[PDB]
Amino acid sequence: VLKSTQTVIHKALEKLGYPEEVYELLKEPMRLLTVKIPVRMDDGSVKIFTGYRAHNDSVGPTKGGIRFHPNVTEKEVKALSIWMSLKCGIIDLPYGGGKGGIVCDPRDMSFRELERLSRGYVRAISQIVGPTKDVPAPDVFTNSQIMAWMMDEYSRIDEFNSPGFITGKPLVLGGSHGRESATAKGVTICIKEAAKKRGIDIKGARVVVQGFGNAGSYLAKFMHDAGAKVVGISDAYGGLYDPEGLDIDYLLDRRDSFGTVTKLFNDTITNQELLELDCDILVPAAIENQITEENAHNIRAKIVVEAANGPTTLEGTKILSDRDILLVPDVLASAGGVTVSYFEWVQNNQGFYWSEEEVEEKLEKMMVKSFNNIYEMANNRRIDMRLAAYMVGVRKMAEASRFRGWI
Amino acid sequence: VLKSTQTVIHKALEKLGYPEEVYELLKEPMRLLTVKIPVRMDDGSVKIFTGYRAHNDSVGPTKGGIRFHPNVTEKEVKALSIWMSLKCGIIDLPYGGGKGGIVCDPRDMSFRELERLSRGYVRAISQIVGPTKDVPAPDVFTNSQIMAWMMDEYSRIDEFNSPGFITGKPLVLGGSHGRESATAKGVTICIKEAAKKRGIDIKGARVVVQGFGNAGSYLAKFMHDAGAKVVGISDAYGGLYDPEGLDIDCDILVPAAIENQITEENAHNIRAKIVVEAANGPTTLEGTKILSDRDILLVPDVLASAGGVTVSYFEWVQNNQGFYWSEEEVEEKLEKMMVKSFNNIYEMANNRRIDMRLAAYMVGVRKMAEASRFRGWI
Amino acid sequence: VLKSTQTVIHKALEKLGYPEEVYELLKEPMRLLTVKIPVRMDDGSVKIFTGYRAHNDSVGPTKGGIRFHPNVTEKEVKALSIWMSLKCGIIDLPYGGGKGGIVCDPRDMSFRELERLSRGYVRAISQIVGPTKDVPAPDVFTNSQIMAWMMDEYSRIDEFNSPGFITGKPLVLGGSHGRESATAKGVTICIKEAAKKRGIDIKGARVVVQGFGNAGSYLAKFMHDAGAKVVGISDAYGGLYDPEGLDIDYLLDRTNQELLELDCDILVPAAIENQITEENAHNIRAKIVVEAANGPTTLEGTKILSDRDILLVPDVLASAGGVTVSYFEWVQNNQGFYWSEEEVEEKLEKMMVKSFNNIYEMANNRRIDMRLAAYMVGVRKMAEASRFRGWI
Amino acid sequence: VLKSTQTVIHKALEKLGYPEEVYELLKEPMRLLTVKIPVRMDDGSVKIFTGYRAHNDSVGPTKGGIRFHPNVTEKEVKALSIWMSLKCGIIDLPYGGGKGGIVCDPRDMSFRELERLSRGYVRAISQIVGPTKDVPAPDVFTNSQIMAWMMDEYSRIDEFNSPGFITGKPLVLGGSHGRESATAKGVTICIKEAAKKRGIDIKGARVVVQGFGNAGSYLAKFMHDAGAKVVGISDAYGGLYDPEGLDIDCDILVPAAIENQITEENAHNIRAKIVVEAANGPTTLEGTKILSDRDILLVPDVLASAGGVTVSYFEWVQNNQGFYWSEEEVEEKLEKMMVKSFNNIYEMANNRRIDMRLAAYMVGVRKMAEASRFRGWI
Amino acid sequence: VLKSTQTVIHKALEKLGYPEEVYELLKEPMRLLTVKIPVRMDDGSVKIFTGYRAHNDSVGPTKGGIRFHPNVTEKEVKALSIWMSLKCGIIDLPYGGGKGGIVCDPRDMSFRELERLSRGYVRAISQIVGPTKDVPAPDVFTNSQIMAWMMDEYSRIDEFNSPGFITGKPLVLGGSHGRESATAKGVTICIKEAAKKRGIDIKGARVVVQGFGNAGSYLAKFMHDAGAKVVGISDAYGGLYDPEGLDIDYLLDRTNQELLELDCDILVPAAIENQITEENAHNIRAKIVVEAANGPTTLEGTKILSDRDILLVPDVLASAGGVTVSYFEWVQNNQGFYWSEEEVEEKLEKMMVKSFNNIYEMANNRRIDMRLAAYMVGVRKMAEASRFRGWI
């Protein structure tokens, strides 16, 4: 995963004619903080939660969300941090890549516990974090409520309101319009572009979405409202299929806080079958490594847009290319989160807030602009979207690190 | 008195459906600093002035003016700080309410004495105020010069220019265009917007402005220039009426004078379709009800007058950017925010079958209630 | 020399009607830091460089560039810091004047030596500079790379990215679009705006650009593209004249007495000093003279042109394009949001227009030339601020 | 490996009667920072070095050295940070354990390269270290010069002299007298104090020092000067014995050499009444037991060698005062603390019927356990 | 002038065997801030005072006083800042040299005007000074009241009591006991310690104090109380001699050629410059000469005394008592704990003794006079520190 991100960054770097030294510098976050966080549990016990914060690169304050998952690991956190630098390079924000992770399961914890842990996180890392250093955001199993708690904790430490510290905030705390679903909106725009690029009509296109989380659900809905047929949908437990397009309104009706909805049905299919669902546009919005060497040949979509971090492997990606499938890379497709996060941060910087229309417009303009830069450079170079996107998303970081004398 | 403010806060929270605990939180400033400031007087003596700075609620940096007046009281600045939250909530500012006061009589103090006091005041409270913490402004007997001194003092303490510490500054110190007309203009925006709701074209609208003083006269020019038949004005010695329209060089009643003009005793008499308050408490509680029972749209002073606060906010934003807005740019943003504010309040009042006064109070109090809850304070 | 700057300051304050004490305040930088910077040289030796940083006046964060030159002097950086206030006042920036200088010869220093010096310079003055205090920029022999190093160093000291500490940065480090054309464009805006005042349509206006060098050539393309008959240009070996209008495009792609005495509407002296002198001032056929260089017209010439109805746009105002965009970069740094090339352009225009017009109108109301009125406007803001804040 | 340290921590907490949750808290550094440091190499290239800084526990500013070694590992610096807490608890320092490491080989790096790396290291971690936060020191291949560079760098970042950021500095930069002899002297104090407990006059005491290397030779001079019959010494090629006493110019055995000299295979053979470790793990676990079963007093290396840490602490104190101690003043304070420490540990071991090793561990771990509980962490 | 200080610095470094580059580093303050301070005068006017603050070298927080005098010059405060390093090196303080100066005449300024200036001075330089950066003190026409004002101002800027910013404070503001007698006592310690080196019992030692002014009279009481035969004193109108010993307590309650040529063990020139010259250096009967004033002995005289076995204790070492106690005040400020009069005394002694002995022993080992050796010891510490920190 990290190993893979590094091959493509290396290839990217080299393809641009960079000294090996630049790869060496970018291949891993320059600063990784891992922390132990004591948490008073409701049962009167005390549990030590392990946290991570990664700063890939500082040529710009680092930016990236914090996830709460049992399967989070230091390795994942580094790789996620590197993604983010690329996303910010790709969209062209004054950010470096960062990410956070706390080994825990919010499904097994209480509202109060999550707050204590949230506040515990900020207290462990406040020193290397803040409006001007490193701005976090939601990610897996975190929401605006967790951002609000953390923001509050940071503000009490700096002794004044520090909205810019962390993005994805509630509107009333200097949050931005459009952030809540920004990720999906970002994938949507990316789908529309890829569709228009392939001569595919969204009006009746069949779209399969793996994962029904915050990115997955809002996405499916945006595709539904775009008039698309969302035929395949899934959470961790399985998929739902309807060649005529699932009742999305209903599916996110039965949906719970954690994005599961599969259990309510008995006619469910497996997640690996879902990935082979006959369709135009496949949207991996779940866990990593879903398109490997052993199913890349079996996917029926001519367009695959990565809403999730690292959903397809190297060979998975090469194969997708060998057989003329259009793959919009994660470092592009999933970057609506940061982009709107970034707006939120500008608004925090200024103390003045944008309308939904202004966010929607700026968001669209930058993504479209980013898709085209990548799609075109992938053309001119006889290379895939991955390598192309990476080349776009590494440009600034490599140039800035050079200007500033690090390499 | 202070309880009057708390009654409003309670009523409003009540209607929103917030638990009693939220009221308990919001009923007093979460932070009050009262200070003693030694000032060297010109006569060689030394006088100790008592100052207060109140931060009602911190769901955003606090914001509010400082008055120099013999009769200012801790209880008063507390109360006023809360009202600032309301306004800030009403305009949807990224602020919380704050307020300052010094027990003194500027009218009996010299120029250099007032400066010493101003600097002393900042020296006393610097620890808890600033561009990111608490942004004062002018009030009763304070002005741009006082603001300047305070800004200079605060900047010395930070060791760098801190324009955004305090608003109402002179233009050269990072002040903002459009202060002079801020309040009046804010009223005009509420009047126009109220017109739209009642399907009343401004171009022929019969407008009545009580008080041809300072804000009144201004409002009259604004309607007459907007093509309204300003069919009536009044100062302190009666009024002028002319159905054809008075050449300032009914549909809308703008009470721009004193309190208790619209009472139970004459509320049923009001011919106007819209009443936009351009002054403090022109209409009693009954009158407000009566007008409500009748289909008369009553635009609350707390919303109508928020123009001043809004532009003070713009100054702070400009300070943050280090970039300063043209007179037109100030104007349009002032409009968008007033319109946005009028409409949120109008629509809540419409949906909830209550007057705009009460709905403004809810909107003024709701934001810091949501924020305080989000941040785990309640 | 430094007194020359002080004379201007005095004259301008004089006319505004400020008391002598205000001049006394503004005549010198309220703050001067001179430092000794040890640099490890490649030859193994150690050389101690002398650096200066001057803050003229603090009615806003100070702003101004740093030059690396063998001949830079404390007296010079002092003088220059004051000129920066003037410009800042002229453009109405929320700045005060500042200026830096290091006694060194970059031409004889290696890449890694220049970096060491740059970092040492920041290390030396970090205490009194920063995004909210004093914002340097490039000058004589300093560039975006030097700016980058300095920015990196300052950021290390704050322990966080501080783009707004120093302007003229590379784009990736939070620099701003529209630096390259800043000055030239600022001139063009003054030219157009001057046209409007004299009721001169640009679309047929006979334009004369002296110096077909770097800014001159640019100005020619701008008028020719704006539909002006660029009826004349000149480099160092004479000039071209053509009443019909010279196709500048034909020339990008490929006497001096006479060029200036050409029958034209707009004369843009974009060359050297003392072209417009008492000896030929009455000869100038142009209705408008917009300076695109330093001191092209002597003091007499300025008067003569004034006595005649010739509108003379002062270099100090015409060239403020560079400073203005450096300011935009700082603003963008404050926002953490970066402006499109077009957005930079329009703001550059609005400020130049606003500035031209304040200065033009003061000159008109007060029956004086634009030079003097610019000086008043350049000096008036910090005089008002300093008084408001109780310094005088 | 790291678990070895954790086993000790667990065992010690176990015996103190702390709940499992305390162990969970103390088993890992509450804070680990790992950094990548670009260094310009002399050959023109650029090498990225990996650095770590670990803060075990914050019940006081953390304290611990930095090693430059090809084989240093994150797991190692973590482990070592914990051992620093133990020592700090043992000496009763107002510290918590911290530790640094850079993966590099100083032996292959030039003078100017090592400086760049040192500055880069400080630049990388400056945010979480400092005189009040985390105080590094020299270790494996780091020295006073490296300390100096790091101190200079940190001072530049604070914009003022920060001697107390890092210890082991040269005297001119605020270093402390008595570093050279710190460890050795600490041993001598434990030896004398152990003597007192066993009613053994030093003046005639037969002393045996294994290893006549650097610390061994020193210890021999100290006993011989104290009037002990240093009846035996040894280097790597055997030993000297002389009942009359060897003129360095048994009662006490001071193993000052290598690990596993005192094993189950010979533990019953030891004639000495007191064994004071002046090196790392000279006695196996069994041997420690055997000596315990026999009435042989075994002074633990972790306590005996705490001289170095203690003087590094003195340097930090002097830095705080901005006042520097005479060589004698350092000596006496070093003694009082070692004596105080020896005695707390001896008495706990006596009261609780356990060896000094285990009791030292308890005392080393108990302080941060009490502090962490007092501060509501557990 | 400033070169005189630099000559000493060079000579001393020279002898230590430091390369020329070290001298280049130490020859000027690495940091000089000169400021313009607007003060509202009582007559309603506004006067702009010029102030300087110099940090010679940063191998420790800088330390040094501020003088208010019409004749203070940038060159002077620079020079003086360097001398402070020397003293600091001599006493082994964790300091570097610093110095302040304001061009003004306190004698013509009112009480409230002097306060405004003092606050303005702190306001001007606050960015680069403070308890951890640069610690001023009183000098020529400044006192504890001025110190108090400055301390109050600085504390306001930090928003907390910062006693350690500036020394020489009144006791209630965190000043230190033992200032009054600091210098005199430091001399006495050098005298006693010099005695020990020459095997001279104090109890019968014939002591001669030139100048029965303020420090002289004090020194006389100290020897007479220590059991020395103060066989001679002098003011400005000749001297008293009495082999049996003058009862200074009489004299205390209530010529110069001869007073100096008097048969004695210890000669303490506590008066003016150039008393010990080539013209009379061979005449001096004393075995030890301890300077209690500035430059009492010419360069030749210093040599002559050296050739003869006469021990000459340098003023720069003998007078370091004042600086030392100012340092104690700063330490106490750091601790927030204040020392008894006795505790100050003993620490003052230990440091003076330690200092005398390092300097004496270097002079003995290196076959040179104590003057030169003091200079080496005064300059050596910041040279070692600067090298350790990679500045040279």
Tab-separated table of N, CA, C and O in Angstrom, chain A residues 272 275-276 282 289-302 304 311-325 327:
chain	number	residue	atom	x	y	z
A	272	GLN	N	-17.239	-8.822	-3.711
A	272	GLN	CA	-16.428	-9.121	-4.888
A	272	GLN	C	-17.298	-9.387	-6.116
A	272	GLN	O	-16.845	-9.230	-7.249
A	275	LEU	N	-18.243	-5.876	-7.442
A	275	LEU	CA	-17.164	-5.277	-8.217
A	275	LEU	C	-17.150	-5.788	-9.650
A	275	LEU	O	-16.464	-5.236	-10.505
A	276	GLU	N	-17.908	-6.847	-9.905
A	276	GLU	CA	-17.998	-7.412	-11.245
A	276	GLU	C	-19.380	-7.180	-11.843
A	276	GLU	O	-19.660	-7.597	-12.967
A	282	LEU	N	-17.865	2.067	-12.268
A	282	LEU	CA	-17.616	1.475	-10.958
A	282	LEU	C	-16.953	2.483	-10.025
A	282	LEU	O	-15.966	3.125	-10.388
A	289	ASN	N	-7.331	-2.161	-1.725
A	289	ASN	CA	-7.076	-3.433	-2.399
A	289	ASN	C	-8.332	-4.208	-2.789
A	289	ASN	O	-8.450	-5.392	-2.476
A	290	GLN	N	-9.263	-3.556	-3.475
A	290	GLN	CA	-10.473	-4.242	-3.917
A	290	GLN	C	-10.388	-4.700	-5.371
A	290	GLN	O	-11.064	-5.648	-5.768
A	291	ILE	N	-9.563	-4.020	-6.161
A	291	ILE	CA	-9.289	-4.447	-7.529
A	291	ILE	C	-7.838	-4.898	-7.628
A	291	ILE	O	-6.931	-4.076	-7.768
A	292	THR	N	-7.621	-6.205	-7.551
A	292	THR	CA	-6.271	-6.757	-7.574
A	292	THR	C	-5.924	-7.370	-8.919
A	292	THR	O	-6.546	-7.074	-9.937
A	293	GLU	N	-4.916	-8.235	-8.897
A	293	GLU	CA	-4.513	-9.017	-10.055
A	293	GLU	C	-5.605	-10.014	-10.431
A	293	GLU	O	-5.732	-10.399	-11.594
A	294	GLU	N	-6.396	-10.427	-9.443
A	294	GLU	CA	-7.341	-11.529	-9.629
A	294	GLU	C	-8.814	-11.145	-9.842
A	294	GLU	O	-9.696	-11.997	-9.730
A	295	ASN	N	-9.081	-9.881	-10.158
A	295	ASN	CA	-10.430	-9.484	-10.570
A	295	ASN	C	-10.445	-8.315	-11.553
A	295	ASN	O	-11.495	-7.938	-12.077
A	296	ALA	N	-9.265	-7.762	-11.811
A	296	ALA	CA	-9.112	-6.656	-12.747
A	296	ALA	C	-9.622	-7.000	-14.148
A	296	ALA	O	-10.152	-6.143	-14.854
A	297	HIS	N	-9.463	-8.256	-14.548
A	297	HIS	CA	-9.948	-8.699	-15.851
A	297	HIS	C	-11.457	-8.939	-15.835
A	297	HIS	O	-12.094	-9.026	-16.886
A	298	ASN	N	-12.026	-9.026	-14.637
A	298	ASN	CA	-13.429	-9.400	-14.483
A	298	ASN	C	-14.385	-8.220	-14.293
A	298	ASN	O	-15.577	-8.426	-14.069
A	299	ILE	N	-13.875	-6.993	-14.377
A	299	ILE	CA	-14.713	-5.810	-14.157
A	299	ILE	C	-15.343	-5.277	-15.450
A	299	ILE	O	-14.655	-5.061	-16.445
A	300	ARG	N	-16.654	-5.056	-15.418
A	300	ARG	CA	-17.424	-4.756	-16.627
A	300	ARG	C	-17.563	-3.262	-16.939
A	300	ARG	O	-18.032	-2.894	-18.015
A	301	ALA	N	-17.159	-2.407	-16.004
A	301	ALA	CA	-17.265	-0.963	-16.203
A	301	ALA	C	-16.127	-0.408	-17.056
A	301	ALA	O	-14.972	-0.800	-16.894
A	302	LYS	N	-16.467	0.510	-17.957
A	302	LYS	CA	-15.485	1.179	-18.806
A	302	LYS	C	-14.912	2.409	-18.109
A	302	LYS	O	-13.963	3.026	-18.593
A	304	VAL	N	-13.805	3.591	-14.087
A	304	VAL	CA	-13.683	3.346	-12.653
A	304	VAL	C	-13.043	4.523	-11.914
A	304	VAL	O	-11.881	4.869	-12.137
A	311	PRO	N	-7.868	1.849	-3.653
A	311	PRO	CA	-8.794	0.727	-3.838
A	311	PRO	C	-8.269	-0.291	-4.848
A	311	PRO	O	-8.709	-1.439	-4.840
A	312	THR	N	-7.353	0.124	-5.718
A	312	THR	CA	-6.814	-0.783	-6.730
A	312	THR	C	-5.297	-0.864	-6.646
A	312	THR	O	-4.621	0.139	-6.422
A	313	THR	N	-4.769	-2.066	-6.848
A	313	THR	CA	-3.335	-2.298	-6.756
A	313	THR	C	-2.625	-1.928	-8.054
A	313	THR	O	-3.260	-1.515	-9.026
A	314	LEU	N	-1.303	-2.073	-8.056
A	314	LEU	CA	-0.495	-1.769	-9.229
A	314	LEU	C	-0.985	-2.531	-10.453
A	314	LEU	O	-1.467	-1.932	-11.415
A	315	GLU	N	-0.856	-3.855	-10.410
A	315	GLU	CA	-1.301	-4.705	-11.506
A	315	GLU	C	-2.778	-4.485	-11.797
A	315	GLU	O	-3.196	-4.482	-12.952
A	316	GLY	N	-3.568	-4.301	-10.745
A	316	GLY	CA	-4.965	-3.957	-10.918
A	316	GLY	C	-5.075	-2.760	-11.840
A	316	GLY	O	-5.911	-2.730	-12.742
A	317	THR	N	-4.209	-1.776	-11.616
A	317	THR	CA	-4.198	-0.555	-12.415
A	317	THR	C	-3.634	-0.767	-13.819
A	317	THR	O	-4.170	-0.238	-14.791
A	318	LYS	N	-2.555	-1.536	-13.932
A	318	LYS	CA	-1.990	-1.824	-15.245
A	318	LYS	C	-3.016	-2.576	-16.081
A	318	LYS	O	-3.289	-2.210	-17.223
A	319	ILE	N	-3.585	-3.625	-15.501
A	319	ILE	CA	-4.606	-4.413	-16.179
A	319	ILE	C	-5.740	-3.523	-16.689
A	319	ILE	O	-6.143	-3.626	-17.850
A	320	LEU	N	-6.248	-2.650	-15.823
A	320	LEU	CA	-7.341	-1.750	-16.192
A	320	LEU	C	-6.970	-0.935	-17.422
A	320	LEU	O	-7.833	-0.556	-18.214
A	321	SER	N	-5.677	-0.671	-17.569
A	321	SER	CA	-5.163	0.078	-18.706
A	321	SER	C	-5.042	-0.812	-19.938
A	321	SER	O	-5.539	-0.470	-21.010
A	322	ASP	N	-4.380	-1.955	-19.776
A	322	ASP	CA	-4.258	-2.936	-20.849
A	322	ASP	C	-5.573	-3.075	-21.608
A	322	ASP	O	-5.597	-2.999	-22.836
A	323	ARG	N	-6.667	-3.265	-20.877
A	323	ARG	CA	-7.981	-3.365	-21.510
A	323	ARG	C	-8.808	-2.077	-21.450
A	323	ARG	O	-9.981	-2.090	-21.076
A	324	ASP	N	-8.167	-0.968	-21.809
A	324	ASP	CA	-8.861	0.261	-22.187
A	324	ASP	C	-9.982	0.709	-21.237
A	324	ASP	O	-11.023	1.196	-21.677
A	325	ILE	N	-9.769	0.558	-19.936
A	325	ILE	CA	-10.726	1.071	-18.962
A	325	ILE	C	-10.229	2.400	-18.387
A	325	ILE	O	-9.039	2.561	-18.124
A	327	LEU	N	-9.593	4.856	-15.635
A	327	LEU	CA	-9.471	4.904	-14.179
A	327	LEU	C	-9.104	6.287	-13.647
A	327	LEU	O	-7.979	6.747	-13.825
